[PDB]
């Protein structure tokens, strides 16, 4: 069969020939493209032995930084624009549906199940925010059996997993919308968010002259039987980082207003225990039938 | 700063513009080439959300499989031909030295320091082999203060790094050559080597219809003051896998003969405890001046 891999040209030709053995058509195509690009990158850059070693070390450290609650490989994808590119290709603003946005590294399915009026945030975790809307079809009809996975930074600038003690989740939950599609829950106003700088991605951003900021945002991931899954986020207006999100997640249609309500009776009705005032985020979620 | 990342074209243009912030000129060039290739790969393949997820999972698992005894990221580089391509670019044969070959995943930082006539292998680790030669410059000058880091599979087809109990290293050592460049040590005859399939790389080889075999080989990593470090391997002739090395390491100039020697006096002189026959591998190492 194949000649000894004596030269760069032969190494590439041999590896490309071996792609033929991949049985699955799609995986074969992906592998052909991967080899082509990997080999071109190495040849075009004349990657040094030391640069290769450093790359091995970085990728290893990236994987080793990952836990069930912090995905450093997602974060790497995010800061290099891969995550946003995949999102744009896969979820084109195609029907009248709420637009898609990046997941990011801090999603977990270890979040509490909640009914409407419950809170995703413990007390003393930031300025009160109430989030509400209806889950609707593009035809305007209510969507039953919808669940909203939602998560955010606390008002102090940290996701729950970035603290040393996590005895329970915080500033996240799985909210079950009602039969008429209505959802409503307590939360806190999210703050401009500095991406964690204590792993390989932080080092990459420093070495490449990048800031590490995301604008304020609230993740919204919605599923319902009969509808396409939406992964998205709302971005409160007026944040100085909206036009320079480090992970390219902001879209104009996902920028939202917050309205302040200073009515102690209303705050208590909504379940806020320390009363006073809250900011209101009212926005429907529009899903596309499957 | 930049327009909202609303489309795939804008995402890529924004990321490429941000590469300009990288201060180091070489790192800037590498990042720009990396972004270009990553983005092109995603667009050319229309990579799906699920395929992205699966890739994140694979890369994470690969990093988490890595230890001081097993470099799964090196193995991944190896099976995709990247390692061999880097080897060829960085040690072009025109310089006149011994050719490079793949490091592989089983180099360790704990090999014993040894002197000429010592063994890298405990008893009952395979058939006896003696390795010898002289370290020379391309210009002919003998090289003082050279060390030969050498490692190989045991005669059952496993590196010490694969053992559940590894109280000491085995079938590896750092042999200090003499002032005149001469080295000599006892070893075992290397056997055809099956790459362990219990990590991500094994799954990748299965999914892509590949075998997991390397021909018999003895790693040789030679360092000396005033010379370029050589990372190479000798490949005994006659092995059925030489023509289909899974990691593209074999080069005709690195294929060696082994002499069968039945000479009891010589066997004892060379330090073989049981005497009897041994295979002799005699090959000089030619290093390139800095
Ligand atoms: C098939 C499509 C593409 C194929 C062709 C391209 C692939 C080649 C693979 C990468 C090869 C070299 C990468 C170029 C490095 C440029 C980085 C310049 C800045 C710099 O040196 O930063 C340091 C090293 O970072 C680094 O070494 C960062 C490495 C980044 C690799 C990212 C690979 C893509 C993965 C992203 C996720 C995508 C998954 C879904 C596709 C930061 O570190 P330090 O030196 O300060 O500290 C020590 C480690 N902690
Ligand atoms: C440095 C760049 C880092 C990111 C890569 C840039 C481009 C992104 C590529 C994404 C798409 C992958 C393209 C090929 C398709 C996969 C191969 C087909 C076979 C297949 O699906 O294999 C499964 C998944 O493998 C896989 O998912 C294999 C992914 C391999 C990508 C590695 C690229 C880096 C090469 C290493 C070089 C080191 C740095 C030096 C420059 C085997 O797995 P399974 O399905 O059994 O279960 C795995 C969980 N364990
Ligand atoms: Fe977030
Ligand atoms: Fe080996």
Closest residue by Cα to residue B223 from B290, B162, B288, B146 = B146
Spatial separation of the C-alpha atoms in residues B65 and B252, rounded to whole Å: 33
Report DSSP state, residue A209: T
Spatial separation of the C-alpha atoms in residues A188 and A124, rounded to whole Å: 9
Among the partner residues A6, A59, A89, nearest to B42 by beta-carbon distance: A89
Which residue is closest in CA terms to ligand 2's atom 17? A31
For residue B168, give every residue at least 6 positions away whose Cβ sits within 8 Å of its Cβ, in sequence order, or none.
Answer: none
A-B contacts at Cβ under 8 angstroms:
210
Alpha-carbon torsion (A179, A183, A186, A192), positive or negative = positive
Scan for tokens 């050589």, then name that residue: B230
Distance A151 CA to ligand 3 centre (A): 7
Q: What is the largest CA-CA distance in chain A?
A: 81
- Length in residues, chain A: 290
Spatial separation of the C-alpha atoms in residues A68 and A200, rounded to whole Å: 17
Spatial separation of the C-alpha atoms in residues A13 and A18, rounded to whole Å: 9
Which residue is closest in CA terms to ligand 1's atom 50? A200
The token duo for A57 is 């070390």
Spatial separation of the C-alpha atoms in residues B70 and B153, rounded to whole Å: 14
Pocket of ligand 2 (CB under 6 A): A 27, 30-31, 34, 38, 52, 55-56; B 38, 41, 54-55, 57-58, 61, 73, 76-77, 80, 82, 200, 203-204, 207-208
* Atom of ligand 1 minimally distant from the CA of A54: 27
Q: Distance from B270 to chain A by nearest Cα, in Å?
A: 34
Question: Is the Cβ atom of A58 under 6 angstroms away from ligand 1?
Answer: yes
Spatial separation of the C-alpha atoms in residues A6 and B21, rounded to whole Å: 39
The token duo for A271 is 């379940």
Scan for tokens 């959300």, then name that residue: B49
Q: Could you tell me if A189 and A126 are in contact, meaning their C-beta atoms sit under 8 angstroms apart?
A: yes
> How distant, in Å, are the alpha carbons of A99, A227, A231, B265, B289 from that of A142?
18, 12, 19, 93, 76
Report DSSP state, residue B289: B
Beta bridge partners of A188: A128
Spatial separation of the C-alpha atoms in residues B11 and B8, rounded to whole Å: 5
Spatial separation of the C-alpha atoms in residues A221 and A183, rounded to whole Å: 13
Distance A102 CA to ligand 1 centre (A): 20
Among the partner residues B7, B43, B45, nearest to A29 by beta-carbon distance: B45
Instruction: Tell me whether strands A182-188 and B147-151 are parallel, antiparallel or unpaired.
Output: unpaired
Three-state secondary structure call for residue B32 = helix
Spatial separation of the C-alpha atoms in residues B25 and B113, rounded to whole Å: 40
Spatial separation of the C-alpha atoms in residues A249 and A254, rounded to whole Å: 10
Distance A55 CA to ligand 1 centre (A): 6
Q: Could you tell me if B242 and B235 are in contact, meaning their C-beta atoms sit under 8 angstroms apart?
A: yes
Beta bridge partners of B218: B234
């Amino acid at each position: 069969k194949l000649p000894y891999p004596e030269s760069a040209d032969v190494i590439t030709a041999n590896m490309l020939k071996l792609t033929d053995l991949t049985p699955d058509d799609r995986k074969r195509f992906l592998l052909k493209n991967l080899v082509t690009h990997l080999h071109q990158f190495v040849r075009e850059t004349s990657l040094t032995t030391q640069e290769w070693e450093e790359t091995i070390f970085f990728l290893t450290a990236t994987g080793q930084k990952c836990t069930p609650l912090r995905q450093e490989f997602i974060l790497l994808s995010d800061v290099l624009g891969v995550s946003a590119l995949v999102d744009a290709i896969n979820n084109p603003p195609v029907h009248g549906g709420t637009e898609s946005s990046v997941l990011g590294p801090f999603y977990t399915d270890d979040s509490p199940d909640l009914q409407n009026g419950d809170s995703i945030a413990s007390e003393d975790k930031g300025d009160y925010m109430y989030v509400e809307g209806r889950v609707l079809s593009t035809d305007g009809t209510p969507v039953p059996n919808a669940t909203i996975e939602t998560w955010e930074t606390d008002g102090h600038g940290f996701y729950d997993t970035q603290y040393a003690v996590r005895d329970k989740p915080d500033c996240r939950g799985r909210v079950h919308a009602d039969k008429d599609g209505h959802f409503g829950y307590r939360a806190v106003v999210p703050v401009a968010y500095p991406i964690p700088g204590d792993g390989p991605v932080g080092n990459l951003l420093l070495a490449t002259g990048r800031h590490n900021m995301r604008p304020n945002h609230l993740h919204m991931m919605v599923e319902a039987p009969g509808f396409r899954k939406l992964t998205s986020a709302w971005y409160p207006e007026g944040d100085e980082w909206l036009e320079s999100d480090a992970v390219f997640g902001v879209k104009k249609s996902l920028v939202v207003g917050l309205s302040e309500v200073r009515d102690e009776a209303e705050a208590r009705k909504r379940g806020f225990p320390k009363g006073g005032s809250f900011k209101l985020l009212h926005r429907d979620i529009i899903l596309v039938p499957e």
